[PDB]
Amino acid sequence: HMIHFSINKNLFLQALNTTKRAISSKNAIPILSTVKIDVTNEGITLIGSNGQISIENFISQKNEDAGLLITSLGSILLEASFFINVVSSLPDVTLDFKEIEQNQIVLTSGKSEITLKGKDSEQYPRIQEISASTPLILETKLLKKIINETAFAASTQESRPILTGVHFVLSQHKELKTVATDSHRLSQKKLTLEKNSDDFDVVIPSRSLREFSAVFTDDIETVEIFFANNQILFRSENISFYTRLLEGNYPDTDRLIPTDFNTTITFNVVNLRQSMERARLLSSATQNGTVKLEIKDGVVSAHVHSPEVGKVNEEIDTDQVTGEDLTISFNPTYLIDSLKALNSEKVTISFISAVRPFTLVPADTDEDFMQLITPVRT
């Protein structure tokens, strides 16, 4: 059984590019740099993986846009980057894909014939199948929104794996909590699901979640989620996206969130971001790298002193300041991250002291979106 099919170059190229999102250049298992191409009666399946995530992108014969004509079945491996570059370089709207002697594929497109050396696919590792379960269905724009609101807060230190993921908890059949922290700052988003589902408690690598947002384009309105202990699957009509879960107990984060406050300030999000980025230009010349907010009698100001380099003294305009005076220093990158995560015009930040973590929420909104930032003692 040797492969032979033809297809529309662009729809093919798109599917390859989606699949490539799970394929690294250098992998510790050499063969995982290849894309795997299974060709059956029903259609073509593109498989890619890197040991953390795997993508199965299927193009069905019956898809009108594919212009997919299948003559012979079979399987093959090609080095993904190269193959993808070559297809992309072909001149015509459709192309011929014909396997021949010794794992070679001839690509005919117009008057241009290009033969690439592939590999037998038996050596490619089969993907472990999540057991037939009841799916959880979420609107994808909701997931992408959770991801943008939380994944940046997760650690990037691989020596503490559990905090490199996002913690997802469904309780009471409809209460969804998502939290991420790197021990310095924290992000938490809570929803109520419109429909009830069976409870779960998982930790999903943040890198996997960033790929989820890239793999599932907005054309796909919902996705089905299946849970195992080791892994989890997101599936649309044509795409299956598996990722590993992080084993271990996620820390109890609820205790971390304060309830009573001495000072609050309500800021324009954009203006504050621009103030913190200015602050950061000078504070990043230092290792300490902190901005100092001074709040005296309704006036709020930012100060950075980077010896040898310069000094920032800026008054920041505010919608509202309540409570008592406060002087507090923090890493401005965390504040910026927090701000970039908001979709609201305004932000309410609430404080306790110069040494206790402070909270930030979007102002004037139903959203249960809560963040924390630990200040720096000085």
Place this chain on the structure above:
Amino acid sequence: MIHFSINKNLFLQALNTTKRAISSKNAIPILSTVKIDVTNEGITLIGSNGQISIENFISQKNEDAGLLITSLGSILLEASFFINVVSSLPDVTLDFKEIEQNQIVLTSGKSEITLKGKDSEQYPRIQEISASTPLILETKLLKKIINETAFAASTQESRPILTGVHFVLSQHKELKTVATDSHRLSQKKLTLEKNSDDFDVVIPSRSLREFSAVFTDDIETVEIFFANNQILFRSENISFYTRLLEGNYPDTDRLIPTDFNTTITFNVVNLRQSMERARLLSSATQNGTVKLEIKDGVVSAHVHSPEVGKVNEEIDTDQVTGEDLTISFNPTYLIDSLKALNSEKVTISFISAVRPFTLVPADTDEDFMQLITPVRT
């Protein structure tokens, strides 16, 4: 000490132009800074990297700058950082005040940012070119030359004269510009509508690439002045100096073959795209070439990369004449030559599989000529 106020965006635009001549790493460390001279007339921004120098003048009388100068002087600031800070400031105007210890307080709205600078006495002077009458060329004429030739120059530092472009004015109106790296060559000849004094110079191709980015299209002309070791392109407000390469540029006229045995006229974009397919596979080889096979009126391209793949393409042709031929060459040289053409078709002319071939744009008045040396296979 310095004190002026100015529109931030015009200041920023002027600093980003000057930056073109400032590198972050330098043998002479002080050259990573921009020098700001402030006089009654205006502000002069100076940068230089040892090869090129830019002086950019903003006049107080410039209506767009909103420049008000109340105290004079001069200072150095580390260019990249300073430019980033100015760029980040919130208000449309900027107050620039020098204080104690070569510090500059930048005030923009409610934001005040102080930067440590350096005394400017240590910055090296730009060498004035000797008094002379200018040569005036349309900026778009020069840009066009630069895109047509600077890429053919070498990047190997071992024959430094080949890393520049050779410019020769002869008979007071006959301009030849040529570049080569010994493997491929580019030549553009022109006649100036007005006479000028003869010259013969070699201008580093990196300096030419910066020329094209310093003088935006709103500068229609520039005045050019010559010394033996440097050259000045000057517009109303910008002086751009570059060093010249000294030495004898090779006799390039002796390299252009006269009579041919085979010619072929191609659509330019079509050919480029076949060559780019040919280069995906050939770049996997060491000395990756493409073989052009011409038998009857049929032209075809071939590449074989033993453990990777192969290309077999029939290239559509507009016209084929003369003897059959099989010739091999670096596809990148062909691609570079095609990218440099501004015409729909190209005419390529061969002698044999081992002698260089020429490319000219087809059906045009332009005296624009390229050579590529094939490889024996």
